[model samples]
Target: GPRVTVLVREFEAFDNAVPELVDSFLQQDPAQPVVVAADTLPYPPLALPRIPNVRLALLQPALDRPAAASRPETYVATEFVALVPDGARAEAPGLLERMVEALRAGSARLVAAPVATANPARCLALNVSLREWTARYGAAPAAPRCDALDGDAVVLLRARDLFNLSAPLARPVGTSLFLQTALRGWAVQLLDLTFAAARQPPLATAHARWKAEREGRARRAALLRALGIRLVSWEGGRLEWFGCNKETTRCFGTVVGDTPAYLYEERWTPPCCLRALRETARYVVGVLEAAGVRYWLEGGSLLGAARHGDIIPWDYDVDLGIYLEDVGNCEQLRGAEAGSVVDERGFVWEKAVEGDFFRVQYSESNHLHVDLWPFYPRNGVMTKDTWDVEFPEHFLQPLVPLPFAGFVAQAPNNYRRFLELKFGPGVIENPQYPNPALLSLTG
Candidate 1:
């Protein structure tokens, strides 16, 4: 793929800036062809190996005629011109005159041109003569300044100049905001396209996967809507809520409420909520172990498992973390196991890796889904006190399972003790107060 670097300059600075930029580019890579887009310049005779291949011509003139006589095709078909910002009305005629002279003298080729100006009044005044000339010649006339350029011909327009137009009186401020937002949006899209073409596989894969997953979810949701079964709660997949709040007795149809205690909720599993989640976690841990993959319960799930051998009833989902080394291996496993879903009723095991985090996602046949996280060692056991691993400080120490269940899991004896030492006993809410620092060990 070809890499393009654009060098931008004001019209007046084109003579001095364009040549230097071209020379600098070539000095770095003499074999590479350089395309210069500016007014004409005096030729510099440099006898480099690629000197004979070098061709210098005005931007407009090159567009008027092909480089080779045998291939009599315009190099570029369209011309883009922008009016000087805040310039006087008297300057409009001169700008138009120079442009016409440039086109007539073969300095520019105008297959189709657009006269863009920030000032509506100036645009209207200029269009009168422009329209007349094009009509008399039976050629296409200039379109409105607001019209977008066709295809890739518009990369030349400067964003600052484009956004300088005053807001229309009837339009909301968001209209002008949208112009800037759209410009940035398109810029990112083009950059991603260019990057993808350059074979940046990691970024390309991530972008494609994200788009596909989101689109798949949207399509599935649309299909369900068409069937008159609106999806309410699909969390971890055991509980499905449809029409309304079960607790409030209010109809939900499409309007979503805050809590799952809504009118139209259903479940495949027994409704001892916390026990069900604990059972799901156990199932996930069992699957990982069966696959010969080592992992530990983590975050709130781990805390719940350690404290109560079950889920914290209020918790929404399970959490886990994996070591960096294991993450790479997991990526390979997930890639090989693509199309396997995971869920509560019956799961197709799907593995997904985003940056440092790895997820083993479970999708049920209908709607339940859950993810397992795997955590890695923070630092060497002896070196833990000497250096910090820069993990989220709040989550630095919690219980982590051993490779096998027979051995004791390792964890901070008392995270609250550490917190109290750092702050003060009453400085924050202490769930256990004076006994907060007591180490709680679990199998």
Candidate 2:
């Protein structure tokens, strides 16, 4: 149980996302202490004292980023403290429980998950370092798994034993501290889940900007060597220690599904959300393929194919494809009771609206969704039936097998080009097109 907050007030999104983060954390554990940290945020704060576990940390400029021995331990009052940033949507329920699970699993002082943003497609990682993408990007062979991240991402710290963090409440602040933990044989767990929205990747490589930080990181490395720090690379066909816990900082994994998907939920009554998603995705390809209509992945699903070649870990729902030509005859979709199913294998199928979209429902309310969008070629301009713009036909030059959600389906031949058409040049690098205006993303 801990406080969750925006941590900064740079934008109005803090007003929105903080409440979301608070609700999600509290949902997992009702008694968890939650706080909203801000510097004079304009929007309204959560109503006072209604949720006794939650409160606001309204810092003045002096407290905003001050150096102090006063650790979060004094404030959070829990063994675990999670620092959530604005705009990174929660993947599903039990995010806080997952962090604690990772902490126990790794014997770590802190645990963090990597990120996939713009609705759960691309990771906040160096393109060169990614493993899931190589099937399409065709770089170094796809790793047995993505590398385990060593640096800071969204994290849950063990408040009981912590380093005196940096003054600015920023990072590589945690980076130096994480390494110090390793020197003492304390582990920092980085989960398979891409947990939050990280910073936008500079179109320029970090090498130039890192020139300023090069000395800082190198200094840490030198200290690491002097300290005889050791880390787990792999053993017994699983990442026992997560690869010395560096270099692969943002994209590493031991295995998926070893831990229960929802750590806080009591048992299987709700059903495993991801297990149901994979099953629905597996079922969708079968449905679409047998239907005999030409279609390709759309939105986040297409982006997942281009980036991870697997379902984006943090995306609670799955996006899918279908032909505008076949929308009418697709009778298998529409109308299932909540928590009911088309068949045991497929979970459930339902439509919230006609023509616009259909959903493969997850058993829990507001949980997983398999959204199908309609697409077709219009003259030489490709367009989605629900979208405003068209792309050149060359974007999806041919068809390819899209590996996702435990099954393979068809996607555009050049998936990245198709994604760039829909999302924009910097799509993969950015976290949220947070503003409503950016949803129609400019070329």
Candidate 3:
């Protein structure tokens, strides 16, 4: 059997666990020759561990410069490298043999182990668009093997193959490394082998969690660029909902609105839908403000603002009132004069055919939209020709500032009066499904 070099990262914090971590691989049955290469942080310097077959190294920061961009592979002298990343310990035997055998037998260039405690979906590297994959609705199947391994897994690969990939970061290096390996036309396989969380000593002082989080974010951004992912829908859960780029001909985990119950939250729309609607509202409000178009939150949107200070969780579209005369001021909305026009960001702006209002859609594919109804003084009340809705002129004598979404947006001076006029009295106390037909689909 070829000699193995175990790489221990974040050694400054977990120096005490190094002996146990190394022993997990070294002390296994059919003992093989193994060595340890460990890297530590700069400050509050700790002495080298008194463990056998172990050598200590310091990050570049400790030597002179600031950035700790040292390559873990540079320290490897053996034919194989076992990356036992931070906060991980061997849970079962034969983990190293399983990973090394996979690599040597041409099964995979990189082999990953699973975590004993973490969810497989959260741990394993995935290539699917996250927008369509929600843990609450769509969970990853318990596969025996996956393409990439969990960060906590003890990864084994030939030292030469490991050097071909990018430098591992402070956070979980699975996503970027796996993508890099894929880019190089190599195979990355996730093994059924499992690892557990290693115990941290009481003397282990706190390290900056923000540093790890920042590194994790940077890693994802880099991976997105490497994978040619253009835009993400939202960073709601652990992973971002990736949007399609121009090169995309096929997409996995496509949500076609089939799961109506999960699609709606408490008979409202899903939280992701609300996220998109809020973004549109934010964009439209910015456009109106920049173009000097006076607009106030309208209809269901106003009901949400007046009552909840946010978009109605279930409402599909945002409602805004703008004077028809001011519609000419916005360049984005001007093209709608002829008919519906698509904007640079794929949003569709269109003028209503049957009503005095304009509609701004999220995209041509996604019908979630914003209605900009035109209001004018008629019969001593501000009225919209479309909805056949009217309110006192004083409601907009001077638009009152109110909280909506997460920012301040314009609202009617008497929002409660506007709601009561539209939906009858006690509208705030009562809640109704905005669309019964849509709600019926959920049933």
Candidate 4:
């Protein structure tokens, strides 16, 4: 890795002040291998500094005539600069790859002299330009060219054209600077997301189960309420319904129009709530495994977990599937310390811990929320993508790792195929889809 030494004219206020600012930038990581040259003397000789573990280089006169020696390309205008490591050269094996990787991992920080303050507005704009350059061209050193000096190669464009009127920051000149800072921050965030995705697996089974359970719960709850049934109590697998009033039962028998005998209020759960449910399911899976209960990923949770090994980054809920025989026992188990049993339309079950659940569900509620659902195997293949169970199906099959998190028993054959059909081929080959179409390396 190479450290840039910024040299400025001793008499120029703005130019001379740049060195201190640049030094501040380098100071961010005092432990990292780097060297700085802060000489301000007039007519200082062009020579490398004698520093240990530091590769010394000069910002020198460009190739040409006398004027080139006195006025080298301005630092702000130089689109590219080469950073030749201590001994590596163009022909060095793996040198380019290693240097590029190191640059990519390096942090970008601004260093400017406090004494060289520009107009507040101009300073803001300059910040924007710096940020944009970093975003458009990643932190890695770009195309390199060997300098006129020996043992030195120029890595093109370490800094960009700050004065370029045609750049992104050039538009809306008056307000551009203000907006540039914000845009740069956004670019960094996008980069962080990209790095995160690259570093972690996708959320396949957990995502799918969360989606399915949310839809199911929303549909079932809404339907029960629409029917005007007073859901008295529901425990284990039994759903109990009673009349809201004694007279209501008579009207229930002879109802006209679209109204049914149940006549209940329906509350539509927001998407954010569904997300909360998915997160809860993830927590539940841990609890079940810790308690020594054999459980399988079910619904969307299973799909997401199998695919990505955790809740989908975009998902807000949780889900799990249990063998028909284990439903009673699971319900009897105490809820996790973080969540409690929530009564939705008279069906009571564990949800996430109090504040954590709400925070998790609403973490991105402007986009989504959490939901959780349990799936029971039904009779022979119910649908192409749904599982089925016979009356006597007792225990769930053993669990297997999902793409992102947790595990699932074998799903109905057709159900597995259906996911492939919907999401695309290779659904089973790799839960994260190997290469997702929507993914952007620079995101």
Candidate 5:
């Protein structure tokens, strides 16, 4: 049997559940060494280290850095390190044995136990593209082999492997370390056992999870910038590979299996394409502002802002609603050619050949575009000719500034009501592909 060292990073100071977690690990036939690193003194702390094979390391209040660089990992003298977050514990004693078996078989460099909550919603299998800086969660793989572990996963890895990683010692340290390991193209495995957290259940969305942690959200931003990822998508679905304009990237297939068998392959709009579309929207916003035109992010753009405060990762374009009278104020868009005309910046501005709206293309080569819908007031409703969706006039007036792709853009005053009116109720909660055929894509 192999010995393992447990590293408990206690984010919540003085959590009463820590001792139970310690006792749970000690219950195993071959009880392993436990190192509890806490930001501050936990209650009844002196007796904690008095227990055989258990030690406590006092870390700085800021978890991103330890009091000493080598304090915790240096305490690890065993062949494997079980990285557990605060308040995590196995329901039974045999978890370490099973986790060790997976790693010792040489099939996986890292092995994880499912981080279970009372709800037991679904098995979390993360697949992240380091090159694209995109991450998505899907159902667990049929085999033990998986692409990556959850951000707060309870994982076991060889001590040497952990030491060799150049992962920044940070608050969202689990994500940083694991993603770094993923960059090395290592295989991760999932054990059948489950580890439970005492305080909070793991939320479904990465965005929501980070917001709950408070500190983790800002940490993720800095981490991504350091990793040179311009943007990232936090979505859930079945993972599959797809071809993009310049490179091959992963997309979410409605179901498992071959390319043709899937119901629909929901491609995550590449970060670069999304960024280009944002720039185009910003340019258009600039033009609208200069002309004193009042517009609001409409359709998918507004939906994205209402949901993720960013563009929908799978959306191909931006949508904005403006009054028909404001169309003539923007010179570049007004008196444009019947089809498409190249602007000074090489963007394509085109009049809707068959509708009362305008389209701003990111570039001639890349058809990613921003659609400006011309809306009108009629009988207390905001109506558009291109689409039959109508919102109460009150929802359109008094536009509110919204956080969008890092810009403060305008959105309808009653954004939620506007979305519910256009896409129907549950629009924010139930995300779907723009095309109606993909409605069957949801699990």
Candidate 6:
């Protein structure tokens, strides 16, 4: 084997996790090198490990600068980008050999492998957006390893010739690199190989997340232009999900009513699940605000909005709870000039007389509905939409404005206390779906 180097983007706080993550690769040590890019990592990258055979090199980076100039080296016998999420380990073996073969085959220039969860029990909610959108009543999970090119997954390629780095690798260095490789006539693919299991933020200390999303959006926008995508628009999601120029028919458009008509390769949908949450969230925000309704962002949507100004990729649903008392009746439904707020939005809303709320749906089968859990302040207790749920009045008051997509929604004045009530203590961060906290709430 020739020199193969895999670049793992890391900012400051994520440095310590580098060593353990690097060990997941099929090839370890000097035979296959792992260069930890210190710039993009969320956790401050670890000091160059004193250990040997791990073959880890600390590459100080200027994440703000253009890639062509920033990186110390670009060409290698085999150059790869492994933006592997934390905790992903490969149980399926011989992945590198296949990447090597893909390179040799000449048909595939940039190669990657699909990631399936080895810890299936721990990851059942991995792609589950709505709790009910599954085997209970919905479709089976989408099968993986469909050979789509995953820009964020580990990709190995011949870079020196393919990388025509005229300027910034905008939107994302990985996406730009993979797409640029394709633009130059290379087949980008997820190879038939072993799977890696991992998910989420590279840094616990934080920082790199929102910074990456904002900057990468710009970078990818420029890259699409280079690819000559004519007239890109956001019906929903960033660049309609994958952000491709669309005219080329490269990005496949998929529909979910009232949500942004997002486009992505179907196989990647499981991984791109958060794109759905994000798409609906914007629509949810716009519709609620357009109608001049009073509501406080609730549940996962609030957590996502308040924390990073974006949705957690793992969590789905654009949820809110309005404080609507049972004042009047269905006249608001039948008697309006607009027919119904539901009909006005080109969708349907099922009004509940007893519970005093509405279930607004964007899909036909109705697996997912953007929920409105109305509440009423009575005495010192807040009566939730469902008669079974109620909490002290203190939790709902003193509403504070929080960022919801590009709009604003209200939240509890003391959000942490609200979380303590909703999901219990230590629920400040995003958790995997069918969350224990969430289970208890609905319980």
lDDT of 1 by residue, 58-101 (tens): 43345456555212112122233222111111112133333334
Q: RMSD of model 3, in Å? A: 15.3
TM-score of candidate 1 versus the correct structure, residues matched by position: 0.27
Give the candidate number with the greatest TM-score: 5
Tens-place lDDT digits, model 5, residues 1-443: 44788877635442235666676677664347888766466665535537657877665555576655444566677888888865576666668777888788867788877666543223345556643546555555644676555544677888888867765245566657656765676767767777876544334466755555676566667776566444443454333222222122222212234232212433345566666778888988887899877799998899999998989866657889888877778777675645568878877788877777788876666666788888788888777867547777788668899999888899988789888978989999998654525445543
lDDT of 4 by residue, 1-443 (tens): 44332322211221222233223323443322333222232233323333442332223444653553332233222232322111111222233234334445544211111111111111221112220111111121221210111111222123442222223222121223223333444211111100001111112356654764465455445443433323312122242333222112222233345332222211222222332344445555554565555555444555665555555433334444444334344542434223444323222243434321111122211212233323444563222123222222233333344443433333333445445544557665654321222323312
TM-score of each: 0.27, 0.37, 0.45, 0.29, 0.48, 0.38
In the range 143-183, model 6's lDDT, one tens digit per residue, is 23221233235556555543345532233554445334433
Model 3 agreement with the true structure over 1-443: per-residue lDDT tens digits = 54667676533352345555655555563344333343445344434344544555444445554452455554567788777655566657666776777777756677766555343323333343323232121222443334444435667778887776555533345555654554455555666666776665212444554555565677667666454443433223454544332223112223355434434322335445566678778988988999999999888888888888998765557889887778889997788988889888777799888776789877776666688988788856886656546677888878899899888899888788878988999998798745556666754
lDDT of each: 0.32, 0.49, 0.62, 0.31, 0.67, 0.48
If both were scored by lDDT, which would come out higher, candidate 3 or candidate 5? 5
Which candidate tops lDDT?
5
What is candidate 1's CA lDDT for residue 354? 43
TM-score result, candidate 4: 0.29
Instruction: Supply candidate 1's per-residue lDDT for 247.
Output: 25
Arrange candidates by TM-score, descending: 5, 3, 6, 2, 4, 1
Q: Model 2, 16-77: lDDT tens per residue?
A: 34555555545556676765554444455555346756665544545446543233334566
lDDT of 2 at 267: 18
The CA lDDT at 325 in model 5 is: 70
Off by over 4 Å in 4: 1-283, 290-294, 304-318, 323-325, 331-371, 376-443
Please identify model 5 stretches exceeding 4 Å from their true place. 14-16, 29-31, 38-47, 58-71, 119-133, 136-143, 151-153, 195-212, 234-443
Q: Show model 1 residue runs off by greater than 4 Å.
A: 1-276, 327-345, 352-363, 366-369, 374-443
